[PDB]
Design goal:
Oligomer: homotetramer
Number of strands of chain A: 18
Bound molecules: calcium ion, nickel (II) ion
Assembly: tetrameric
Largest sheet of chain A: 8 strands, antiparallel
Number of helices of chain A: 0
PDB class: lectin(agglutinin)
Protein name (chains A, B, C, D): Concanavalin-A, 2nd part
Order of helices and strands of chain A: EEEEEEEEEEEEEEEEEE
Keywords: lectin(agglutinin)
Shape of chain A: globular
CATH architecture of chain A: Sandwich
Structural class of chain A: mainly beta
CATH class of chain A: Mainly Beta
Organism (chains A, B, C, D): Canavalia ensiformis (Jack bean)
Helix content of chain A: under 10%
């Protein structure tokens, strides 16, 4: 059904489906079983920043995640996205909790997409930046338990009144407009995405993670994708 | 029904509904009868550029239109748009022909919107730029006779195969995503729009014009708004 | 000698040279005696944000200053800058202390300048953004007591080791490259500047203020402009 | 003496110093003998566009050159620029003619540089765009025979009144402000440059080419670098 390309910030090690034995960042190409991962020294309760870049000349999806005063983690994977995704896609953020939980709060999110064609100066571009989310954010499609406006933040999974994260939750937020990522006369297509997040758990084992993803425009949350499947995949294949 | 704020590039003088006796640029606030106009030395067959700017501190909508090697025309009007429009709007381009006609071709269009709130650095922004339109432009809502892809251009009104403009035509193109133009904690909201066009008529009296407009998100073409009403207003009141 | 256009964030009321009896924001056109001022509820020790905008169609210089959780102050003045400044200028930040003092710390500064000419799509632009200053910032010209790198901030006036502001200090920082603000074929010239600051004093009466300014490219600090003259004017005329 | 990293658009095949037997685009790292080249189907008298991209996560310098209605040429090379260049550099365009000649006209040039550090949202950026050059362009350092203003274009090598290119010419234009390309707390540094050019020769064998380059801030034209050395290298080593 959906075609998903995602960069996951995976907080819980599910070693039975291929995760390493630690928090990690990974690049998922149509499967929760990451094609490449890197150890991520996740900091509970601290605001982090994730940067994702890609361009059609090099065909390498790379992501860098860091916390203030700390060294960053980075992961890269050679993949030609024109061979994986459709030419029109929607970009979004997804997150889940299962038996273990954590808040999956997004404080800001920016995305820039550029298609430069061969006609002298023909640049088509799309850029959006949210540094504050309001209760009725009409340019975002919120799916599942995701909500906006609480402290001007985007809460991808359920948090009850007293600030506590709830288990078995799943929510996604996609930018309203389709994004054009390939066109026959384009000589270079590129995108850059940045988002700051705050993962906080009252427990020693937070779960499950946050993922930036790109999908077919009509993507919806697969049934049963709470927990380890990050609201993105229908199974662990 | 719709709330329309528009900058018109009016090619035909309908003196019975208040137009001056020449081509002109005007600022229309919920009525085809422009609140302010300026003489426009329209050049048949030449590519022109229109720039529209506005910000919530000054509350002045201003537009400048020019052709290469020619002096420009400019018109300004003091209007507080928070008192006219909703906080969520869609922006677009509209054009029509009636008994007289002209092609209403758009070669490029860019728009930037910014809402800066009082939280240190809280800037929400939206920017899109089209320098080429493809046949299935999924991020544009095309209404009426508007079509994209012909020579990579956006044709707002019908043009038959041999390049000829057809009379009694009306078409509009709106960017897919809603635009947020007011928010309770914003200290300055501003937008800037730019578009290049090519109006060409085989006749001495081209009609009717092109207009950049901002409307309620669900705006559609009013019945009978071909001709002098520019695909924007239901009557000449 | 220099031609100065500045937006001042004046913390000390010098009623003998025309200040109102409170902290205020003012627009200074070649004189410390502001052409227009607005009361500013200055918050000692809090990080504030100042936004300055202007465009050649409207000819209105406007500034908005705000603190988180507080209402903002705004001041506007109709002035045609092509009649005041040269076509090539340098932009900068200035600050001083006299018998009373305060820290004049800049945490970030961005500036965007655009000159759109009548040649279809001819846009010349300049944009810089500093969210962190390093000890050897080669793209800034630092004058007087200004220094960069201390906590990644720009300190316009002297602060001694223990974090204390020193009196009788004056410092300015200008972006290295000249900025083009007028050109014969330009149909609209515009700029936007934003900077966040932290004014902190151990005293009940902080002095003297911070100012964003635009000057002739070779501007230097006038002799004796500590205190009330903000490192910008040679006298109080 | 200078440290040069350059992308050359080489119009003349000097097979004795390693050029292939055709026009080509190459990546030069401190030597005119390109580390990697790709065949370039150069079109005499047509306006072309060159795009150069690089980021510190991937460490790959890539360039794409194309002409309207034609397939593009692309070349890539894995190189860590932090190991080659200083942290502060100047970027520019260079061109030369020797016994064979061609005009080396630049019609537009844009550059964007970004340093994202690990402090949440700490983005330092620099962007400039020239779509028109004036006779006294104060933000450009012109070296050798380079001049601006002729038809609003930048002429890197001498062209006599009647529009004819002169042999044995060399000229360079660098943006005035230093560019910061590395900083100790940066997690991703990236740049993108774009320029459109018009190479025209009355002869069947045009020479010598145009190059986009990055150098130490005080770089000047090496003695005797007309011809095959592109105004960049002192010898053919
Ligand atoms: Ca997992
Ligand atoms: Ca009319
Ligand atoms: Ca004062
Ligand atoms: Ca050669
Ligand atoms: Ni994983
Ligand atoms: Ni009219
Ligand atoms: Ni004052
Ligand atoms: Ni070569």
């Amino acid at each position: 059904a959906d075609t998903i390309v995602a960069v996951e910030l995976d907080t819980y090690p599910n070693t039975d489906i291929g995760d390493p034995s630690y928090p990690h960042i990974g690049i998922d190409i149509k499967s929760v079983r990451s094609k490449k991962t890197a150890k991520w020294n996740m900091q509970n309760g601290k605001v982090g920043t994730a940067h994702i870049i890609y361009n059609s000349v090099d065909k390498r999806l790379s992501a860098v995640v860091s916390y203030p005063n700390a060294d960053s983690a980075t992961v890269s994977y050679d993949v030609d996205l024109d061979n994986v995704l459709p030419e029109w896609v929607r970009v979004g953020l997804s997150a889940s909790t299962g038996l273990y939980k954590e808040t999956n709060t997004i404080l800001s999110w920016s995305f820039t997409s550029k298609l430069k064609s061969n006609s002298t100066h023909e640049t088509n571009a799309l850029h959006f930046m949210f540094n504050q989310f309001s209760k009725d954010q009409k340019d975002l499609i919120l799916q599942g338990d995701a909500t906006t406006g609480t402290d001007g933040n985007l809460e991808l999974t359920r948090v009850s009144s007293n600030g506590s994260p709830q288990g078995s939750s799943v929510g996604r937020a996609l930018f309203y407009a389709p994004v054009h990522i390939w066109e026959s006369s384009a000589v270079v297509a590129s995108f850059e995405a940045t988002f700051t997040f705050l993962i906080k758990s009252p427990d020693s084992h937070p779960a499950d993670g946050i993922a930036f993803f790109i999908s077919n425009i009509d993507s919806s949350i697969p049934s049963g994708s709470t927990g380890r499947l990050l609201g993105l995949f229908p199974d662990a294949n």
